Amino acid sequence: KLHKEPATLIKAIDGDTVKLMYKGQPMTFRLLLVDCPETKHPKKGVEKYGPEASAFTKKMVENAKKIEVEFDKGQRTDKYGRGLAYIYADGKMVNEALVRQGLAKVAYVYKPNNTHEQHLRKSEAQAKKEKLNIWS
């Protein structure tokens, strides 16, 4: 059974990366199942909707009363040592909000870390249907 744990904001880094205090230690978290356009991309750099994705995540976590982290059932860190998690801001999943707003696409999925895959794909289809941001 997945479950949410408390965490404390340190700072928002990008649309899909946030630094959090978790069980007492600073950690970088990568949001599961979503790909945002980049502001600091390995190759290109500041992609379109990048600054917007990043402002969205930032406001959402900066304005919350409570942030919670939810690990999936597979590996909890990636090769770069980032935690892989669903992030909640006052009970609202940041990963889904981004997708619902057309500020992220659903990423390539790796079982078994795919528990919220269907909900997100459904929000992505609606953002597409409404032609929002990335889908316009």
Side-chain angles (χ1 to χ4, degrees), residues 12-117:
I13 285 145
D14 241 349
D16 55 26
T17 304
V18 302
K19 210 189 224 59
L20 260 30
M21 190 70 59
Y22 167 75
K23 290 221 264 211
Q25 55 211 133
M27 267 188 75
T28 303
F29 281 77
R30 169 82 170 64
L31 295 178
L32 268 172
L33 294 188
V34 320
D35 288 282
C36 279
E38 227 71 306
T39 60
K40 64 220 19 134
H41 179 251
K43 318 296 208 355
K44 164 192 195 183
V46 208
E47 321 180 280
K48 228 193 139 348
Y49 292 111
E52 287 96 338
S54 165
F56 185 98
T57 299
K58 164 176 224 301
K59 308 327 240 135
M60 188 165 183
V61 299
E62 296 201 333
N63 285 148
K65 327 211 306 197
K66 296 182 14 259
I67 292 190
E68 292 162 298
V69 301
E70 202 181 42
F71 288 110
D72 207 329
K73 55 201 20 146
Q75 42 277 82
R76 306 206 184 342
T77 71
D78 61 15
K79 70 189 196 244
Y80 297 101
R82 304 181 289 182
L84 292 173
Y86 303 104
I87 297 306
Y88 294 87
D90 294 321
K92 297 152 216 142
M93 198 202 302
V94 179
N95 315 50
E96 193 262 349
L98 286 160
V99 167
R100 183 54 179 98
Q101 294 290 332
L103 292 170
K105 285 198 209 283
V106 180
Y108 188 70
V109 185
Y110 302 116
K111 283 235 228 0
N113 281 345
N114 63 165
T115 300
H116 296 308
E117 190 191 1

Side-chain angles (χ1 to χ4, degrees), residues 60 65 117 122-123 129 136:
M60 188 165 183
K65 327 211 306 197
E117 190 191 1
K122 289 158 152 200
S123 303
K129 199 106 13 271
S136 63

